[PDB]
Each structure stands twice: as C-alpha cells, then as structure tokens.
Design a protein around this ligand. Structure first.
Ligand SMILES: COc1ccc(S(=O)(=O)N(Cc2cccnc2)[C@@H](C(=O)NO)C(C)C)cc1
Ligand SMILES: [Ca+2]
Ligand SMILES: [Ca+2]
Ligand SMILES: [Ca+2]
Ligand SMILES: [Zn+2]
Ligand SMILES: [Zn+2]
Length: 166
C-alpha cells in the first residue's frame, strides 16, 4: 500500500532540476553523480517527469551530505539509525534530499548504498510517502538488493503515477 505525503504535494512542472550541493568523501565524485543520475532515472522512466542536473544556480532539488544538526531542524544521529531524509515538492527546502554523512556511502554494499537510498529519497522529493508494501522501494526499511538488476515494484509505479500518471 503506497502512501502519498500528507496534503498531496506534487511538482506542477515536468522539467525539474537538481544540484549536488557537496560530495561525500566516502565515494568517488563520479560514482556519486552516477548513483544520483540513475536514481532520478528510475522515476523518469515511469512518469512524464524529466530531471536535469545543474552545477550553478538554484535547482528544484538540492542533494546534500550532512552530519548531525545541519540547518533544517531535522538533525542526523551519527552512524546508524537515520540514513537520510528528504522533503516533499515545494520551493525552498522542498524536494531537497539529505544524506547522513556519518553513514558510510558505497557504490555497492560495503556500507549504506547511495543509489538505493537515493531512489527512496527522491520518492519523497516527488511526493510519495511510506508504503506498507514490503517489496516497494518506498517501504520504510533499508535493505540492500542487487543494484544492476534493481526495478521499481508495481506498488511504487502505481503510486508515483497516481500523482503524475504517464
Ligand atoms: C531504502 O531507502 C531508505 C532510506 C532511508 C531509511 S531510514 O531508515 O533512514 N528512515 C526510515 C525509517 C525506518 C524505521 C523507523 N523509522 C524510519 C528515514 C526515512 O524514511 N528516510 O527517507 C526516517 C528516519 C526519516 C530507510 C530506507
Ligand atoms: Ca545516522
Ligand atoms: Ca528545493
Ligand atoms: Ca560518510
Ligand atoms: Zn536535513
Ligand atoms: Zn523515507
């Protein structure tokens, strides 16, 4: 059972921009770009949404790696516990995705997988809440799965399209 964030916030545009505010030292700069790019694509593939990376200017979605208290009244808790959090569509912090820098970000499973976490986070950026369906990416539980073969569950697609269709 997919859920939509309270209020049902959605982007009213299809051309959405994102920008990587900073890079975690755990991964190689380009692996980070790859992870996020691929994470956005997971959602582009099933909706009329198009995501474009920018390096300067104000992006709709800001991606940032932060530790503890980082200026949004949603403090991280050190390694473990909270992995990341994002905000529903809207201007300002809206759509932004934060990743706890106290976690160890990896391209695979050596620690916390950026890509997978990012897919789940971007789901929030777009207006999706937590799903009760345990096999949905929007399920509140982190669980590493093969990345090279990853695929959105029927629940996720059904939920994301109930907001933007396709
Ligand atoms: C697959 O991607 C994931 C990304 C982050 C997480 S998370 O464990 O950090 N988490 C979910 C959660 C689980 C259990 C209890 N409370 C909260 C945060 C969440 O939902 N972030 O988006 C929550 C504390 C705000 C889990 C999975
Ligand atoms: Ca943490
Ligand atoms: Ca924003
Ligand atoms: Ca780290
Ligand atoms: Zn934050
Ligand atoms: Zn979540």
């Amino acid at each position: 059972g997919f859920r939509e964030m309270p209020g049902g916030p959605v982007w009213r545009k299809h051309y959405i921009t994102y920008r990587i505010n900073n890079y975690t030292p755990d991964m190689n700069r380009e692996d980070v770009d790859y992870a996020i790019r691929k994470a956005f694509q997971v959602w582009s593939n099933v909706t009329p949404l198009k995501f474009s990376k920018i390096n300067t200017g104000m992006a709709d979605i800001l991606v940032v790696f932060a530790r503890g208290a980082h200026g949004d009244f949603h403090a991280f808790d050190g390694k473990g516990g909270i992995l990341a959090h994002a905000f529903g569509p809207g201007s300002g912090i809206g759509g932004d995705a934060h990743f706890d820098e106290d976690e160890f970000w990896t391209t695979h499973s050596g620690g916390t997988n950026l890509f997978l976490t990012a897919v789940h986070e971007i789901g929030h950026s777009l207006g999706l809440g937590h799903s009760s369906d345990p096999k949905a990416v929007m399920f509140p539980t982190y669980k590493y799965v093969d990345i090279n073969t990853f695929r959105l569950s029927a629940d996720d697609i059904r939920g994301i399209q109930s907001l933007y269709g396709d």
